[PDB]
Amino acid sequence: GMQSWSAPAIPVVPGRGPALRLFDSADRQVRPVTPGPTATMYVCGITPYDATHLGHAATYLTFDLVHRLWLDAGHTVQYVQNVTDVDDPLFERAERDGIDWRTLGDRETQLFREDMAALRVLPPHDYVAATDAIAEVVEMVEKLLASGAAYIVEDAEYPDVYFRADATAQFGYESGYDRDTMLTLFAERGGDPDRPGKSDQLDALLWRAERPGEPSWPSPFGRGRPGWHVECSAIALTRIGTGLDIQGGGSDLIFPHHEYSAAHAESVTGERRFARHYVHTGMIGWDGHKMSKSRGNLVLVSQLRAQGVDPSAIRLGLFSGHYREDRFWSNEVLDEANARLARWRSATALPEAPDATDVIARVRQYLADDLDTPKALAALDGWCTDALSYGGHDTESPRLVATTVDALLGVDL
Numbered sequence: 283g284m285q286s287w288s289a290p291a292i293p294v295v296p297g298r299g300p301a302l303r304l305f306d307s308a309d310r311q312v313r314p315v316t317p318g319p320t321a322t323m324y325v326c327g328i329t330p331y332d333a334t335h336l337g338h339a340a341t342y343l344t345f346d347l348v349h350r351l352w353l354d355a356g357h358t359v360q361y362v363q364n365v366t367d368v369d370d371p372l373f374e375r376a377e378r379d380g381i382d383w384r385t386l387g388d389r390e391t392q393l394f395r396e397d398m399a400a401l402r403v404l405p406p407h408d409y410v411a412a413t414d415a416i417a418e419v420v421e422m423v424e425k426l427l428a429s430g431a432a433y434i435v436e437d438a439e440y441p442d443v444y445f446r447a448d449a450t451a452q453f454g455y456e457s458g459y460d461r462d463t464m465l466t467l468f469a470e471r472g473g474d475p476d477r478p479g480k481s482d483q484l485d486a487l488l489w490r491a492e493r494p495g496e497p498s499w500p501s502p503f504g505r506g507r508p509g510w511h512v513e514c515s516a517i518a519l520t521r522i523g524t525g526l527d528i529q530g531g532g533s534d535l536i537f538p539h540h541e542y543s544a545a546h547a548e549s550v551t552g553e554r555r556f557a558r559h560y561v562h563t564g565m566i567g568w569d570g571h572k573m574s575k576s577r578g579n580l581v582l583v584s585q586l587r588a589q590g591v592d593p594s595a596i597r598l599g600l601f602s603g604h605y606r607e608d609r610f611w612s613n614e615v616l617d618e619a620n621a622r623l624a625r626w627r628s629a630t631a632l633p634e635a636p637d638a639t640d641v642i643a644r645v646r647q648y649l650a651d652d653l654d655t656p657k658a659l660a661a662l663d664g665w666c667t668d669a670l671s672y673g674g675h676d677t678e679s680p681r682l683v684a685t686t687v688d689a690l691l692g693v694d695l
């Protein structure tokens with residue numbers, strides 16, 4: 283659909299380690315990721331404003347690990363990401379910034395492209411803009427109208443189409459929150475608990491009808507725009523199908539977003555489980571709020587690259603913590619990545635070093651354990667201390683360690 287970014291080289295490392303075990307946010311426990319021969323991943327993409335902040339980075343870098351660890355095990359991978367190129371935050375940024383919303387999003391998607399290519403994240407295989415996915419969303423919203431799972435609000439001028447929360451008996455399994463806590467998040471994450479004519483406070487917009495002053499598209503439900511959640515479950519369903527191994531994104535999406543996407547797809551395919559694994563991750567600004575230009579807490583990787591930070595240092599930086607930990611960027615973390623990058627690059631430049639077959643198996647093992655990069659970086663800190671301090675005799679373990687750090691981690695040594 284849309285052009286993504288370019289793929290870095292992917293060396294193949296001989297051998298295999300343990301199969302991936304990931305934490306599933308839904309079941310609140312670590313279960314094995316058992317994929318098919320074609321392994322499938324959908325990660326919620328960007329809303330094209332605020333370039334690539336470290337929250338975006340931390341997120342797509344984490345699924346890079348899954349992407350890469352899957353490839354090393356021998357799986358072929360179908361990775362679909364999306365762009366929310368029409369969205370209410372986007373319009374608010376456009377109107378404040380005195381710039382057109384489409385011109386904004388196109389330039390911001392371009393900035394994301396370059397930051398991902400700079401960070402050596404493997405591209406998705408289908409890159410789908412939300413505006414390029416109206417037909418799929420209409421075709422879906424038709425099917426939930428037919429099953430009564432959706433309805434049209436009693437508003438002839440603004441005939442919004444809404445999704446019944448109880449359209450599905452298992453609604454709430456992924457998020458796990460009670461109704462009181464679900465309500466108060468809905469209002470803080472771009473939803474309408476006060477919209478008149480609604481059957482349930484927690485029903486989610488499926489098709490927002492034409493408002494004056496707003497872009498829109500024709501449909502059997504009137505003219506207007508799609509809703510957020512149905513966008514992603516539509517693209518996910520049509521490009522992959524009922525057997526989705528991983529659904530991932532930033533942490534805010536545990537609810538509403540991912541809860542409702544699953545609810546939509548399950549209500550139309552009859553499936554009980556939309557995704558075998560729900561995976562969430564994220565960075566926060568210095569203030570404990572999500573990063574945004576509005577808050578004055580935005581750090582762009584573009585600004586770090588300008589500050590002269592190696593893109594690999596950004597990887598080691600963010601990987602120094604576990605992905606379900608409370609990651610925070612700082613000059614402290616930047617220096618540990620810079621020292622760690624220096625230390626690793628000198629060991630891999632040695633003429634001969636001790637055998638590495640072991641430390642490769644320890645790294646393959648730590649990553650398969652819910653992506654345990656803290657313990658995987660330390661095993662490499664140790665193979666480096668032994669090599670620099672004491673030396674070895676494999677004239678091949680330098681290059682082998684370099685190229686396995688590249689394949690599995692994306693770090694360029």
Ligand SMILES: N[C@@H](CS)C(=O)NS(=O)(=O)c1cccc(-c2cccs2)c1
Pocket residue numbers: 326327328329330337338341365366514531532533534563564565566572573
């Ligand atoms: N377009 C939607 C998804 S359909 C969206 O959420 N877009 S986004 O640009 O807000 C975004 C994307 C990826 C990660 C994060 C964050 C992770 C942790 C903190 S923020 C934020």
Ligand SMILES: [Ca+2]
Pocket residue numbers: 308309310454455456457458
């Ligand atoms: Ca659950």
Ligand SMILES: [Zn+2]
Pocket residue numbers: 325326327514531539
């Ligand atoms: Zn999404």
